[PDB]
């Protein structure tokens, strides 16, 4: 029924892997599983087996799969599946795409399945070094099918198919109150308050979905706010190897609204953090590589009390800022608040034959 | 001073060519000139002239100048000299060897001088064999002296002398920081690192010289280093016609040394890439013909900022790889780093004629 299936083949075209998605959503309780099919030619290297491997690792230094480069690597998850000899399985049942594939591809095609643990870090990449050190780093999910005598002796370019899938993170919307924040200011020798209060929609987070900031100014003073500057900043803390903090503005609107002396003011401003507007802004904290059209700003890290922060590698967070600029008279002032929000990957549409086969290679 | 001069004469010996050397060093700023003499007695076919030409070509399909077989040939440098009757006396600057080689010889001794401009590819031949989808290809420097009236005249095998010299490349040891590389690994279920660091005594090696790899391994993990594997690889990128990337280990030391858990280790390993061993099988960039004891493993191509990469034909480069193979008692992982170096050609000499002839032929 119109269904896309992505495929990639070994250099020598013998081994071919098929997957129904490139991106695998973590719903906090459970990630959707990596269900796939491998179509093998028993007449190259007939004694040999085919294996498939999921490797979730934090890497640091020229992040690719290269040696000239890699300075740090920490393993986070691995899973080895013997696919061509249908070995005594864990015996979790087969899936509709797997059958539909083996029903289509042949009996030389054999499945593999990986179940990704919950609480592992979603795919994320970042290219540091503004004026100081810090090399390209990320968490990537590599699935690789290869023909070998045994997992012992090394893989060769000819037989091995290497797919870098994505695990992207979704969370559903929350009940309770919107993000709200406020502050009061009294400048020298006035004793009159300036009251900035601002608000959001706590759930306000799927990629592309805009941000509606409500701003309220009670200005009892006799200074005027010249302009109002709202912004979205992403915060990135590297916690493995070479720890380092980053903060990057990924949205802005300088508004020329002014709040008169002894007045009150209200508005909604609306903001959309976009990756386009920010490409090689020293390339900090994407959910993919810079070159692929798939790539968005990375999602917020989900933590829990006591959850291990450092085997997440990169903690991403987002905040909205609202600032009042003043400059009244003849060191001009800043009154600001900031409101934090989560940022998630949008939920995917819920609810012979038409089956369409594409390259795994991204745009 | 039993001075060796390499002589070759016509198949029917009216023309005989003499050279001071078969190999001509490139010291990056300028090449040794091809100072030689032509000894002809003015009686044979075209009682007008004898010429000498230097030709530098990349060839693919065989490795000589042939009609049947040459599938691609890119011309890189051609020089034509008229050595009989002496052409206008503006390139009279003679060399100290040439003067001996007209005095020791008859009045029929006429010199030639070729100046090779810098930045040409040094002599190189590459032998694809079983593994490949290709045949012989390489860069030759061919000196050809032949008698004619014309020089558009078809050259006579009867009339020709043809001798393939080499242009070998030299680089001077530049001190500074030596090559270093390091990586840190953390394996599944632990945050204890395994750290590997390596270093070479120099950057610029010369053929036959040993290379000393200094190894440091800090194993804070619970795992044992089952073996240490030090190796040398040549990479030869064909950039012309039928591109290809080859890769060949040319040295290998897999020592039985072990790093036990929560221990450290250091050892300086010394290995030398040779080619002498089994005379290279297939795919190896040599600087000459396999058949000659004369020839080495190719030298590295020296690259420059702004350099036109493709007109070099084959890009040759070498790296040392240091691999730790890891496991613990009763699917095992490996931690490795790589270090480049520059393999160069040693300089021969910095240590009333008595000029004595060698038959110009490699042994």
């Amino acid at each position: 029924k119109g269904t896309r299936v992505f495929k990639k083949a070994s250099p020598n075209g013998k081994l071919t892997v098929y997957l129904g998605k490139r991106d695998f959503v973590d719903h906090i309780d459970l990630v959707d599983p990596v269900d796939g099919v491998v179509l093998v030619d028993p007449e190259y290297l007939k004694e040999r087996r085919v294996y498939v491997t999921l490797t979730v690792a934090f890497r640091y230094g020229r992040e690719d799969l290269d040696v000239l480069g890699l300075t740090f690597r920490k393993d986070l998850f691995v899973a080895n599946v013997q696919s061509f000899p249908p070995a005594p399985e864990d015996k979790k049942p087969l899936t509709r795409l797997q059958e539909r594939l083996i029903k289509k591809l042949g009996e030389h095609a054999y499945p593999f399945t990986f179940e990704i643990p919950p609480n592992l870090p979603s795919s994320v990449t970042l290219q540091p070094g503004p004026e100081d050190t810090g090399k390209a780093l990320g968490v990537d999910y590599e699935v690789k099918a290869f023909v070998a005598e045994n997992l012992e002796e090394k893989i060769h370019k000819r037989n091995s198919v290497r797919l870098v899938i994505r695990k992207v993170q979704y969370a559903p919307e929350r009940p309770g109150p919107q993000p709200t924040a406020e502050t009061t200011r009294q400048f020298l020798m006035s004793d009159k308050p300036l009251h900035l209060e601002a608000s959001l929609d706590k759930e306000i987070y799927y990629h592309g979905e805009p941000i509606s900031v409500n701003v309220h100014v009670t200005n009892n003073t006799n200074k005027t706010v010249k302009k109002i500057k709202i912004s979205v900043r992403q915060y990135a803390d590297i916690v493995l190897f070479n720890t380092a903090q980053y903060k990057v503005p990924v949205a802005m609107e300088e508004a020329d609204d002014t709040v008169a002396p002894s007045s009150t003011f209200s508005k909604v401003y609306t903001l959309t953090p976009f990756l386009a507007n920010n490409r090689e802004k020293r390339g900090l904290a994407l959910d993919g590589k810079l070159k692929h059209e798939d790539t968005n700003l990375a999602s917020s890290t989900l933590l829990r009390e006591g959850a291990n922060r450092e085997i997440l590698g990169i903690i991403v967070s987002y905040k909205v800022k609202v600032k009042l600029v003043v400059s009244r008279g003849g060191a001009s002032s800043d009154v600001a608040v900031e409101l934090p929000f989560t940022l998630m990957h949008p939920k995917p549409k819920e609810e012979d034959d038409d089956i369409v086969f594409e390259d795994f290679a991204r745009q | 001073k039993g001075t060796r001069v390499f002589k070759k004469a016509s198949p029917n010996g009216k023309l005989t060519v003499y050279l001071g050397k078969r190999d001509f060093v490139d010291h990056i700023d300028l090449v040794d000139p091809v100072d030689g003499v032509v000894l002809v007695d003015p009686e044979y076919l075209k009682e007008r002239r004898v010429y000498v030409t230097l030709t530098v070509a990349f060839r693919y399909g065989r490795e000589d100048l042939d009609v049947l077989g040459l599938t691609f040939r890119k011309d890189l440098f051609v020089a034509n000299v008229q050595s009989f009757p002496p052409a206008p006396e503006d390139k009279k600057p003679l060399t100290r060897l040439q003067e001996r080689l007209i005095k020791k010889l008859g009045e029929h001794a006429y010199p030639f001088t070729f100046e090779i401009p810098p930045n040409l590819p040094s002599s190189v031949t590459l032998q694809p064999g079983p593994e490949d989808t290709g045949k012989a290809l390489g860069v030759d420097y061919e000196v050809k002296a032949f008698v004619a009236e014309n020089l558009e005249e078809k050259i006579h095998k009867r009339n020709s002398v043809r001798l393939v010299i080499r242009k070998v490349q030299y680089a001077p040891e530049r001190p500074g920081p030596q090559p270093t590389a390091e990586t840190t690994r953390q394996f599944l279920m632990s945050d204890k690192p395994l750290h590997l660091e390596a270093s070479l005594d120099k950057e610029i090696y010369y053929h036959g010289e040993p290379i000393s790899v200094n190894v440091h391994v800090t194993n804070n993990t619970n795992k044992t280093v089952k073996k240490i594997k030090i190796s040398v690889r040549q990479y030869a990128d064909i950039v012309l016609f039928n591109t290809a990337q080859y890769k060949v280990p040319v040295a290998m030391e897999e020592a039985d040394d072990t790093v036990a858990p929560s221990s450290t280790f250091s050892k300086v390993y010394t290995l030398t890439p040779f080619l002498a061993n089994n005379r290279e099988k297939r795919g190896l960039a040599l600087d000459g013909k396999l058949k000659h004891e004369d020839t080495n493993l190719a030298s590295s191509t020296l690259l420059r900022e702004g350099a036109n990469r493709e007109i070099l034909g084959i890009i040759v480069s070498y790296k040392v790889k240091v691999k730790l193979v890891v496991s613990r008692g009763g699917a095992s992982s490996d931690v490795a780093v790589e270090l480049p170096f520059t393999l160069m050609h040693p300089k021969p000499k910095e240590e009333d004629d008595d000029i004595v002839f060698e038959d110009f032929a490699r042994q």
Binding site: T53, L65, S160, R162, A361 | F187, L188, A331, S332
Partner: peptide, 15 residues
Amino acid sequence: LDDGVSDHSADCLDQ
């Protein structure tokens, strides 16, 4: 009493 694999190679192009 061991750990996972240590993969090594590269796949998709960049020109």
